Amino acid sequence: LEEDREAVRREAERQAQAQLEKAKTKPVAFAVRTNVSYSAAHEDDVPVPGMAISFEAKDFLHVKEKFNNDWWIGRLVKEGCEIGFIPSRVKLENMRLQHEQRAKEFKLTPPYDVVPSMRPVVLVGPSLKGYEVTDMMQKALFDFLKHRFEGRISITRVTADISLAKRSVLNNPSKHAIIERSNTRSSLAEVQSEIERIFELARTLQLVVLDADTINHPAQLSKTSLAPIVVYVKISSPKVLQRLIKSRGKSQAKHLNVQMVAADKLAQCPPELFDVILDENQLEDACEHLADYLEAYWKATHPPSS
């Protein structure tokens, strides 16, 4: 009767437990940013009781392996989350239909977006790239990161305009899509190639840092599939920026005006569009701030198991 159903569920739990444990040290198959929240609190046929992964919308998940059509094995990208069971999109959509059927009975779109397995770090500010103050100030930060995270870091130049890398544009198989692109910046093929280059650089869970020439503002990457960590190098006083640009001679100074415009553009950007804001006066202090953030990220994406 019920005692043999319990024997079947007990052994099966043990198989799942074993799969789960074996998957602990496995590489990440892919990453997702979630579009929906999921709570495991109230359900059965979860492969191992208490082991389902609950998550909020906009959380990042690392998927390691397929358990079955309903469940994958992976983890919430968060310092102490261990492996667990994540509901597949099919399950989540079935849960949505069941919720809709319940709703009718009262008689009163993609849950997961694929993302790089490590969020690429992007630097914006204090002003426009291709000018000396911003370029020199970012170079300093890039040199530090190469040192502080040597062995765990990949810093790469991206000249291609990855701002054109809107997710829908890149999924579009149609050979007619090109006739919609008024003057293109760079080529969408090259952009796609470059996006896959970034996904690939992060596949082994090393920190990825992009030196992205075309990105001066977070809104240029928000529609993309990169889910970057956007680090805002902020000079708080415009008077300071003006003087810094003037320190670089008459040529640089001739474009004081555009430079101050971009700076002010970033300055009115909502704080929520950035992941980190480095407004420290001293390189050493900004560097430490950035390292603390990236070290915690490292811990979110690795800690004890591997």
Binding site: E132, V133, M136, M137, S236, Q282
Partner: peptide
């Protein structure tokens, strides 16, 4: 505080040469 900002930011720039 402007002199502080400037001096720190100036040496930061020099580190980016």
């Amino acid at each position: 505080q402007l002199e502080e900002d400037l001096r720190g930011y100036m040496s930061w720039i020099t580190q980016g040469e």
